């Protein structure tokens, strides 16, 4: 009824009565807590009275009021106080609320405890009551027995105690699920946790939960390992592999691996597996040339060309003297990238006349592109244009130098170092532009292969070549040096770079240093922030400039909002555009992993007073969706493809085309326009060789490597980043700055190849596995899921998706263990039945290799 009678009872004596009071009161608290709300001080004093037992009643009673007061930590505290008056399975929303309300509070504490200690939860710092009830809810979550529910909590609950046990307990290997439940959180963990260590702790145990091996997924563990970059695991695997040893099992693991571990990391296992004893096939998978072959094989096979239209472009003009004539030196290289053809190259021998000493140089570099992945001939290809075979131009002669490692990146270190020797040879001297280029073109190709390869010499030999202060030469040094130490690099270079930057007197020499910084500040994230800050602190763009890239290479992929947020305002606020522009551009890296809002994001900067803004937009957006969709994102840029400055749209051309390979034709109709708009522009005499350039490029972009090849980074195939995928962009980023660049863009070029291969040494038995996709291998240049046999699955267009509406036939000799791994390029039908039908097929590899 009314509690004034109870408020009467309150201070009225006889704790008995007061017992009765509380109790009685407690039942009717719900209505009258309001009336009661005033006596809480006494109620508090009651709860302070150990003499009177029930006062937890009063506490919980107060808790109730506190809910009805909105007081919760109050309530929780006095819910905590109760424990008895309180019970979890007492159901009131209030309870279930304070149940909840309790739960949360734990987390931050736990987080704040996770802050300090990562075993904090193993310890007392959190109110056990909470932790108990918390885990008792985890129990209830365990009883919920969908433990993702428990997991995401314990995820933030940070208790692997919970997690691991719940896993292991629930590990029955739900065979694939206990694998996947991990992945469900694990993949989530990748997305979730601030502290990787926490998640790193995950990856190990998970692996071990998986290393429990009722044939755990290795590619799972691969990226897991690849995210950890822990050789032992792989070795443990490799052992465990060698224990399990099977060609396709080893191969696919190595195929997992060869798709995954960093060039740097990988060599460990290489050395390891070598030292381990091994399967040389694995060591041969470490080549990956099989793919280069296959890719070329694919290319050479699957190249779709129309150089005529390209010729039509190449005939659309010879001009800008070189500069446009330069674009086609490249767009042709695109289609021919790795495809090893002189098609138009001969078509103009007078080409060289219209080539400029740099284009003459540049045209020379265009080869390694065309020959990319040809692990012998490309050298022999450069041989005539190699130094000592002379050339028409020293710069032509220089082009090979760089143009070389295009094929050999990571594999030409020797020749590189050899060239470096030639560099080192001319390093401390010979300011001849010819030499400079010769130096530079070499100073290009050096870090090219040496990229990811840490050799101080590379850095060093350049460092003075750098320090030799040839805007020509020392520029490439500002890069290769980074390329060397691209990574965490070394701060001393950083000092010196940063030093040289301000120190060395040149625009570009000073400039490119920022890159190498950004290079050797890679994934470092929090690390470079100082230099970043220093770069931020730069009066100049160039440091600030690179800082963005630095923050990118630091934070690229995963968004650091703050970094981004900084980068934004930094870009947003800054005087110099290209800073903004580049900074804007640099966003799409730390923003890579979600292209998603990037359009919505750049939608802000889609509009600007400033083109450079609207320039900077195109890339970062065009970057994140390059291997992706969003005509949305695209169509954002189409007005910007009309943004008055060709240079602006020039990007937008390219930027979109970066997205738009393989996507064409009523899958995407607009490509025609886009292609036309190129041609439009390319035909337009009043559209610039800004525009036409990018267009012809963007065209040939869509057409690169016979147009059948793709562009990938943080490859969902692996799930893993490719630094190399990044680089070409970042390289090409400054170009109308330094034109002889874009050839870097060849990096992310990625095969759509589907070729039978084997889970063994490859008879290349080819089959079209035939599960239907709405047909986008039929949506593609001239010149959904029906689970029906798809028409034709063997190489060509495919798609990562149009891959994944198709599935194998079991009926052939060879079968994958991975149940259609889902990745065209990775191919490898695993080999179940050799020395039989499923015939035999070969390749230029099989020819020479």
């Amino acid at each position: 009824t009314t509690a004034a009678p109870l408020l009467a009872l309150l201070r009225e004596n006889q704790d008995s009565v007061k017992t009765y009071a509380l109790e009685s009161i407690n039942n009717v608290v719900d209505q009258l807590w309001s009336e009661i709300s005033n006596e809480l001080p006494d109620i508090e004093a009651l709860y302070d009275d150990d003499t009177f037992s029930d006062r937890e009643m009063a506490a919980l009673i107060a808790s109730k009021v506190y809910y009805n007061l909105g007081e919760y930590e109050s309530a929780v505290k006095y819910a905590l106080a109760a424990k008895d008056r309180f019970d979890i399975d007492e159901k009131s929303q209030f309870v279930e609320t304070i149940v909840s309300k309790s739960i949360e509070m734990y987390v931050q504490e736990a987080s704040k405890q996770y802050t300090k200690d990562e075993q904090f939860y193993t310890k007392d710092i959190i109110d056990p009551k909470l932790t108990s009830i918390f885990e008792r809810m985890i129990e209830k979550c365990l009883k919920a027995s969908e433990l993702k529910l428990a997991l995401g909590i314990a995820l933030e609950g940070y208790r692997l105690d919970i997690i691991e046990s719940a896993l292991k307990s629930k590990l029955d290997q739900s065979t694939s699920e206990n694998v996947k439940i991990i992945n469900y959180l694990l993949t989530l963990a990748i997305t979730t946790v601030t502290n990787s260590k926490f998640r790193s702790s995950i990856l190990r145990k998970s692996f071990d939960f998986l290393m429990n091996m009722p044939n755990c997924d290795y590619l799972t563990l691969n990226k897991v390992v690849v995210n950890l970059n822990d050789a032992g695991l792989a070795l443990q695997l490799f052992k465990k592999l060698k224990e399990e040893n099977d060609e396709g099992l080893s191969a696919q693991i190595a195929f997992d691996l060869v798709s995954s571990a960093s060039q740097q990391l990988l060599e460990i296992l290489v050395t390891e597996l070598t030292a381990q004893g091994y399967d040389p096939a694995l060591l041969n998978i470490l080549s990956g040339l099989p793919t280069c072959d296959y890719y070329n094989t694919f290319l050479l096979n699957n190249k779709n060309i129309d150089i005529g239209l390209l010729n039509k472009s190449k005939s659309s003009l010879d001009g800008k003297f070189s500069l446009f004539h330069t674009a086609v030196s490249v767009a042709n290289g695109f289609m021919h990238a790795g495809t090893t053809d002189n098609s138009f190259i001969k078509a103009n021998l007078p080409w060289l006349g219209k080539a400029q000493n740099w284009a003459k140089f540049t045209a020379t570099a265009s080869l390694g592109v065309i020959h990319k992945g040809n692990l012998l001939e490309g050298k022999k290809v450069m041989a005539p244009y190699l130094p000592g075979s002379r050339a028409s131009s020293r710069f032509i002669k220089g082009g090979s130098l760089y143009g070389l490692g295009l094929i050999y990146a990571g594999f030409g270190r020797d020749t590189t170092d050899y060239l470096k020797n030639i560099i080192v040879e001319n390093s401390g001297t010979s300011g001849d532009e010819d030499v400079d280029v010769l130096l530079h073109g070499a100073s290009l190709g050096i870090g090219l292969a040496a990229m990811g390869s840490a050799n101080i010499e590379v850095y060093e030999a350049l460092k003075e070549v750098l320090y030799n202060d040839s805007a020509t030469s020392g520029e490439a040094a500002a890069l290769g040096m980074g390329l060397c130490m691209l990574g965490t690099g070394k701060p001393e270079a950083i000092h010196d770079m940063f030093t040289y930057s301000q120190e060395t007197q040149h625009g570009n020499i000073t400039r490119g240093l920022a890159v190498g910084l950004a290079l050797i500040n890679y994934g470092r994230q929090e690390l470079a922030d100082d230099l970043i800050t220093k770069m931020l602190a730069s009066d100049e763009s160039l440091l600030r400039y690179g800082g963005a890239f630095t923050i990118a290479l630091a934070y690229a992929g995963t968004g650091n909002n703050s970094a981004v947020k900084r980068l934004l305002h930094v870009a947003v606020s800054d005087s110099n555009d290209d800073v903004r522009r580049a900074a804007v551009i640099a966003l799409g890296f730390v923003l890579l992993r979600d292209y998603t809002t990037v359009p919505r994001i750049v939608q802000l900067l889609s509009k600007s007073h400033n083109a450079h803004v609207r320039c900077g937009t195109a890339f970062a957006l065009g970057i994140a969706c390059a291997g992706k969709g969003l005509q949305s994102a695209i169509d954002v840029l189409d007005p910007l493809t009309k943004d008055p400055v060709d240079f602006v749209r020039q990007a937008a051309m390219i930027a979109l085309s970066m997205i738009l390979i393989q996507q064409t034709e009523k899958l995407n109709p607009q490509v025609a326009d886009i292609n036309k708009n190129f041609l439009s522009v390319i035909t337009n005499k009043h559209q610039e060789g800004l525009a036409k350039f990018g267009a012809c490029v963007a065209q040939g972009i869509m057409n690169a490597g016979g147009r059948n090849v793709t562009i990938q980074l943080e490859n969902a195939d692996t799930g893993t980043l490719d630094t190399k995928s990044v680089v070409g962009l970042v390289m090409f980023s400054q170009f109308w700055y330094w034109f002889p660049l874009a050839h870097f863009l060849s990096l992310s070029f990625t095969p759509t190849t589907v070729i039978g291969i084997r889970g063994s040494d490859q008879a290349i038995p080819k089959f079209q596995m035939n599960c239907y996709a709405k047909e986008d291998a039929f949506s593609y240049p001239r010149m959904k899921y029906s689970s029906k046999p798809y028409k034709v699955d063997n190489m060509t267009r495919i798609l990562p998706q149009q891959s994944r509406y198709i599935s194998f036939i079991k009926d052939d000799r060879f079968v994958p263990v991975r149940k259609f791994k889902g990745n065209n390029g990775v191919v490898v039908l695993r080999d179940r039945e050799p020395k039989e039908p499923v015939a035999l097929i070969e390749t230029v590899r099989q020819m020479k290799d």
Binding site: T192, L604, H609
Partner: protein, 39 residues
């Protein structure tokens, strides 16, 4: 509880995604107002 962990979590991104903008604005505000001048 859970699919939120998937789902719910993702929306602080939006929280952030929201957050950035005013910043841009204030700049842009100033941007006009400084640009506004010589006009």
């Amino acid at each position: 509880y859970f699919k939120l962990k998937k789902l719910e979590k993702e929306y602080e991104l939006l929280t952030l995604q929201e957050d950035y903008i005013k910043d841009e604005q204030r700049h842009l505000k100033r941007e006009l107002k400084r640009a506004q001048e010589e006009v």
